[PDB]
Paper text:
About 1600 Å2 of combined surface area are buried at the dimer interface.
Ribosomal RNA synthesis in Escherichia coli involves a transcription complex, in which RNA polymerase is modified by a signal element on the transcript, Nus factors A, B, E and G, ribosomal protein S4 and inositol mono-phosphatase SuhB. The SuhB monomers are folded as an alternating stack of three pairs of α helices (helix pairs I–III) and two β sheets.
Numbering used by the authors:
A (entry chain A), B (entry chain A): 2 to 258
Write the structure that this text describes.
């Protein structure tokens, strides 16, 4: 795919910049969008690289990014949904777990996806109908058949703490069944880890379209399922995400019911 | 220090073996000690390398490991406390976050400590009175002065689920004050991340002496504090650990009170 090629180039170019800013934390300094949500010059500098790169082969495509909103082009049938740095808190604390997320949707259907870990040099790619890969290895997800002994990735609603006590409950009910959780601070990498089988499932409240647009396709092409907290497909409206293989999502949702 | 030198060699040698078994997951297969606690041939194979290495320069020292218990020597004034692979669940799932933990105690006082991430090639070292380093960079911990906006590492009691509901409460009370948590699956690396400032604090219930013997010294020589859940120093008996800089541990314990 020609569009997959461009996405990997922009992801790798932006990943190279983010990495170098990590090993040389000379000029990084933050800025507060919301309570406990931050922006850095490295976010916008890597965002500029992604836009620039996309726009030498397709600057007529609409580009939707977290930091600049919708920047529509002439061809509105194709839309790049970009997260320049998923895991900004981790980056500021110099916790080396973050990634570049790039998704392409064609008239409302995601065709390609890229999640790139610059610190580990791990490249997750997906193409619709053509499977999902990690550095050239096809991903099949987790062979888990129930919630017994499962490791579940998740995130806390530090952007929507009005649902704090609701989230705490859901964790305990799941903890009553599952073995452990993982809280990594990167939703894109959490979804990539579900598709790779490094964890068994994922759930978070109120994600943002660019947080999961690429990661959702990784899970689906690894044989997985994505849904909202009530089993429906209206998570593009809500940002309430449940992801995993069919039985786990099944068992996860039954526990949630 | 001559003993620090040997500890790094055994950590790196065992780390090299664990790494190679990760990139070539040919022969790994697990075994169940307790519910949701596993052993692999790679644990004991790396444990054998550590014992062998320690025992070419000091086989008269007592060695305490998770998988073999106490193997006492003639000189019982010095004791190596070894975790060959902290993060075994992560290793089986091929989640690349684990480490080798090696601590040396001399008549009951920890003199040296090593935590080695083989996947990231990150070497955390500490020597009593001589500071803590990461790949030759001295660590000072987190400059956080309260719990506002803090990232706290923690673990779930999947080995002692009788305290599940007590742990869930404590998380919610802390979540009422702090921004987010991190759940990585490696207590040794969590403690190393507290000393490096990648996270701001740590708390877990019922850890095991080799889980934290090396990591505790990393925090202390980074200017940090370790205590039990009631502010005392009787955590060698309990395994209930709170770690961070003095104000955070202070603020963490006040929230816990
Ligand atoms: Mg972002
Ligand atoms: Mg271990």
């Amino acid at each position: 795919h020609p569009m997959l090629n461009i996405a990997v180039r922009a992801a790798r170019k932006a990943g190279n910049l983010i990495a170098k800013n990590y090993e040389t934390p000379d000029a990084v300094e933050a800025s507060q969008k919301g309570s406990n949500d931050f922006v850095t010059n490295v976010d916008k500098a890597a965002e500029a690289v992604i836009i620039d790169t996309i726009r030498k082969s397709y600057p007529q495509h609409t580009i939707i990014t977290e930091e600049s909103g919708e920047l529509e082009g002439t061809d509105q049938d194709v839309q790049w949904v970009i997260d320049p740095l998923d895991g900004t808190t981790n980056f500021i604390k110099r916790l080396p777990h973050f990634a570049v997320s790039i998704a392409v949707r064609i008239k409302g259907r995601t065709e390609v996806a890229v999640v790139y870990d610059p610190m580990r040099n791990e490249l997750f790619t997906a193409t619709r109908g053509q499977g999902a890969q990690l550095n050239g290895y096809r991903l099949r997800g987790s062979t888990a058949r129930d919630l017994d002994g499962t490791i579940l990735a998740t995130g806390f609603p530090f952007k929507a703490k009005q649902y704090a006590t609701t989230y705490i409950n859901i964790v305990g009910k799941l903890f009553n069944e599952c073995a452990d959780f993982r809280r990594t601070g990167s939703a894109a990498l959490d979804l990539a880890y579900v598709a790779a089988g490094r964890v068994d499932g994922f759930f978070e409240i109120g994600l943002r379209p660019w947080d999961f647009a690429a990661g959702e396709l990784l899970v689906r092409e690894a044989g997985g399922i994505v849904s909202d907290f009530t089993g429906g497909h209206n998570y593009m409206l809500t940002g309430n995400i449940v992801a995993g293989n069919p039985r786990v999502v099944k068992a996860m949702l039954a526990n949630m019911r």
